[PDB]
Amino acid sequence: VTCDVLSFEAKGIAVNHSACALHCIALRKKGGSCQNGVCVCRN
């Protein structure tokens, strides 16, 4: 749900994606990572 690096052909289609990532980024970050199913923000 968060540690999903795999991607598929979904241009404009509702598909499960790492929300925590884009969240922290757009919030006050740039990069994103996961650890043992745990959301981790990075530069």
- Cβ proximity of 38 and 20 under 8 Å: no
Which tokens sit at 23?
């969240």
- Cβ proximity of 10 and 2 under 8 Å: no
- Cβ proximity of 4 and 33 under 8 Å: no
Method: NMR
User: What residue spans define the domains of the chain?
Assistant: 1-43
Strands (E) across the chain are located at 31-35, 38-42
35-33-7-13 Cα dihedral, nearest 10 degrees: 110
- Cβ proximity of 37 and 2 under 8 Å: yes
Q: How far apart are the first and last CA of the chain?
A: 21
Residues paired with 43 in a beta bridge: none
Query: What amino acid occupies position 34?
Result: C
37: left (phi over 0), alpha (psi -120 to 50) or beta: left
- Cβ proximity of 38 and 19 under 8 Å: no
